[PDB]
Amino acid sequence: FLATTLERIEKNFVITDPRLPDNPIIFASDSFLQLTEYSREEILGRNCRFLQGPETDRATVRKIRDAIDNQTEVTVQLINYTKSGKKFWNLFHLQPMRDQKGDVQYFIGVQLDGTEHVRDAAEREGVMLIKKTAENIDEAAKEL
Ligand SMILES: Cc1cc2nc3c(=O)[nH]c(=O)nc-3n(C[C@H](O)[C@H](O)[C@H](O)COP(=O)(O)O)c2cc1C
Fold first, then answer.
1. Which of 6, 22, 99, 132 is the most buried (most CB within 10 A)?
2. Which residues hold Ca(2+) 1 (predicted)?
3. How many angstroms separate the CA atoms of 108 and 37, rounded?
């Protein structure tokens, strides 16, 4: 699966299609693949929960579940794992992408990887970056 132009955008993100069973990944950026160590072929058609592992806070995962079910945005931080089992902190932002009648068509997920739970200035700057990134991908996804 050769990268589309969308997938060559130099940010970590995935797009899922909630019409397909278990809301699977249909697009994943090259940066996301570099971060997580998976090939595109390995993760297309899978739900993103494969990134979770033993030290992932399950209460935080439920916050994400609730946002998806209520079709709203959420921003959380949680521990995720690469294919080889390397841990990273993920400052994660979810938002729905809506069509011209306001119905949700896709979900966008943006990941900012780090080595620690961030707070205060680092958190603020991280959230600035991931929200701007989500906006750019929302525009890009409009014509998919
Ligand atoms: C667009 C999108 C991106 C997601 N990205 C991540 C991610 O980076 N890390 C993660 O742990 N979960 C991610 N998730 C959340 C899981 O896919 C799943 O929704 C979560 O585990 C809650 O559902 P579950 O209880 O059925 O597992 C993402 C979900 C969506 C829709």
1. 6
2. 41, 44
3. 20
Per-domain residue ranges for the chain?
A: 1-144
Round to whole Å and give the CA distance between 70 and 108: 15
As a three-state string, the secondary structure of 13-31 is EEEECCCCCCCCEEEECHH
Candidates 11, 51, 64: which one to mutate for ligand 1, based on the most atoms within 8 Å of Cβ?
64
> CA-to-CA distance for 83 and 35, rounded, in angstroms?
10
In short, whether 94's Cβ falls inside 6 Å of ligand 1 is yes
Experimental technique of record = X-ray
User: Domain 1-144 falls in which CATH fold?
Assistant: Beta-Lactamase (3.30.450)
Asked if 31 contacts 7 with a C-beta cutoff of 8 angstroms, the reply is no
Burial class (CB in 10 A: 0-12, 13-18, 19+), 52: middle
Expressed in Å, this structure's resolution amounts to 1.6
